[PDB]
């Protein structure tokens, strides 16, 4: 994860992490007892998404403000697995909407 944030932009990071989580689920079923599947996927979500949240959050502004629908959907799916992931995306979307709304309403005669 640490390597993935520095080498990949937020769009790519998200696509790779979604792939890795799936690889991990497959890996868990190939080797482990079912009692371990959830604990392992969670450990992966913690280390790949939660420990690297600040990077996702920095690019979240740009991703929202540019309305990149796929990246936003991918960002939403990853950030929804982390309890502290959605609040910043929510605030950034709120700010994007607020600024777009003030601009649309203040210039009225």
Swiss-Prot record:
Superkingdom field: Eukaryota
Subcellular localization(s) per the UniProt record: Nucleus
Post-translational modification: Neddylated; which enhances the ubiquitination activity of ECS (Elongin BC-CUL2/5-SOCS-box protein) E3 ubiquitin-protein ligase complexes. Neddylation leads to structural rearrangment in the complex that allows interaction between the E2 ubiquitin-conjugating enzyme and the acceptor ubiquitin. CBC(VHL) complex formation seems to promote neddylation. Deneddylated via its interaction with the COP9 signalosome (CSN) complex.
Role description: Core component of multiple cullin-RING-based ECS (ElonginB/C-CUL2/5-SOCS-box protein) E3 ubiquitin-protein ligase complexes, which mediate the ubiquitination of target proteins. CUL2 serves as a rigid scaffold in the complex and may contribute to catalysis through positioning of the substrate and the E2 ubiquitin-conjugating enzyme. The E3 ubiquitin-protein ligase activity of the complex is dependent on the neddylation of the cullin subunit and is inhibited by the association of the deneddylated cullin subunit with TIP120A/CAND1.
Family as reported in the entry's similarity comment: Belongs to the cullin family.
Subunit structure: Component of multiple Cul2-RING (CRL2) E3 ubiquitin-protein ligase complexes consisting of CUL2, Elongin BC (ELOB and ELOC), RBX1 and a variable substrate-specific adapter; this complex is also known as ECS (Elongin BC-CUL2/5-SOCS-box protein) complex and may consist of CUL2 or CUL5. Component of a ECS(VHL) or CBC(VHL) complex containing CUL2, RBX1, ELOB, ELOC and VHL. Component of the ECS(MED8) complex with the probable substrate recognition component MED8. (Microbial infection) Interacts with human respiratory syncytial virus (HRSV) protein NS1.
UniProt remark on domains: The Cullin neddylation domain restrains the RING domain of RBX1 in the E3 ubiquitin-protein ligase complex; this restraint is removed upon neddylation of the cullin.
Name this polypeptide is given: Cullin-2
Organism annotation: Homo sapiens (Human)
Gene designation per UniProt: CUL2
Residues of the full protein shown: 223 to 331 of 745
């Amino acid at each position: 994860a640490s390597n993935l944030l520095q080498e990949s932009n937020c769009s790519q990071y998200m696509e790779k992490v979604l792939g890795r989580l799936k690889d991990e689920e497959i890996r868990c079923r190939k080797y482990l007892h079912p009692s371990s599947y959830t604990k392992v996927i969670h450990e992966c979500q913690q280390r790949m998404v939660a420990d690297h949240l600040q990077f996702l959050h920095a690019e979240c502004h740009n991703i929202i403000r540019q309305e990149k629908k796929n990246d936003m959907a991918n960002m939403y799916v990853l950030l929804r697995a982390v309890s502290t992931g959605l609040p910043h995306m929510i605030q950034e979307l709120q700010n994007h909407i607020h600024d777009e709304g003030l601009r649309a309403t203040s210039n009225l005669t």
